């Protein structure tokens, strides 16, 4: 049994794996109450407490990450790198889904064309992976596509905000990813004119978008591995 610890403030987090990710609760959209339990040795965490209730807007986004998230970076990450300057990017994750809430399981990748984000992404991007998911919740913006990429098939959604918005919502959900080739999705939103590839990418991050609820949820078994040309 690995330490844990239960983190309920709206902007709590932990260093987890020796440095290597940083786990948050991350409540950014409301102010209604959420913990986390965290394993501290691998990262993983399960909602054990989550009282939203937002409408269509999220009210939160408990995560574990790679990088920089809004200047805040775990140990050695090799982030920020320009997006033309990856030579590959691939993730595991595993997640348990719940039945009742509405919420998703989705990875969350920030762009911008600054080498620091301590004051966030606009002027750059988001990228979402949306693997799994309850209760009719839509990404941003507007459908533009339907792509092959990584293994599967995802719908592409696209905001124009004060960043650009790419969420790819996979056809049929999943519960884990193996070896997920995040790089693909990087290179199909470059082809689409969505992310700049002079832009750096600045985090990784995978967790659940949450709209109503989410007590039960749980995040296991990630990893992250990042080249660079």
Not at 177 to 200: H, M
Not at 204 to 227: A, M
Request: charged share 20%; proline share 3%.
């Amino acid at each position: 049994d690995e330490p844990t610890a239960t983190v309920c403030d709206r902007w709590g987090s932990r260093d987890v794996a020796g440095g290597r990710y940083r786990v948050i609760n991350n409540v950014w959209g409301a102010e209604t109450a959420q913990c986390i339990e965290i394993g501290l040795e691998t990262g993983n965490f399960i909602l054990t407490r989550a009282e939203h209730s937002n409408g269509d807007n999220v009210a939160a986004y408990p995560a574990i990450y790679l990088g920089c998230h809004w200047g805040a970076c775990t140990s050695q990450s090799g982030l920020p790198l320009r997006v033309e300057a990856i030579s590959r990017l691939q993730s595991n994750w595993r997640l348990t889904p719940i039945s009742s809430g509405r919420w998703n399981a989705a990875y969350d990748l920030w762009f911008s064309p600054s080498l620091t984000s301590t004051n966030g992404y606009s002027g750059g991007a988001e990228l979402m992976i949306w693997l799994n998911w309850r209760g009719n919740v839509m990404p941003g913006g507007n459908r533009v596509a339907t792509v092959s990429l990584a293994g599967a098939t995802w719908e592409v959604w696209f905001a124009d905000w004060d960043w650009n918005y790419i969420a790819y919502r996979r056809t049929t959900p999943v519960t884990e990813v193996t070896q997920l080739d995040l790089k693909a999705f990087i290179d199909d939103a470059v082809a689409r004119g969505y992310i700049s590839p002079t832009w750096y990418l600045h985090a990784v991050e995978t967790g659940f978008e949450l709209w109503e609820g989410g007590r039960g949820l749980k995040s296991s078994d990630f990893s992250v591995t990042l080249t660079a040309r």
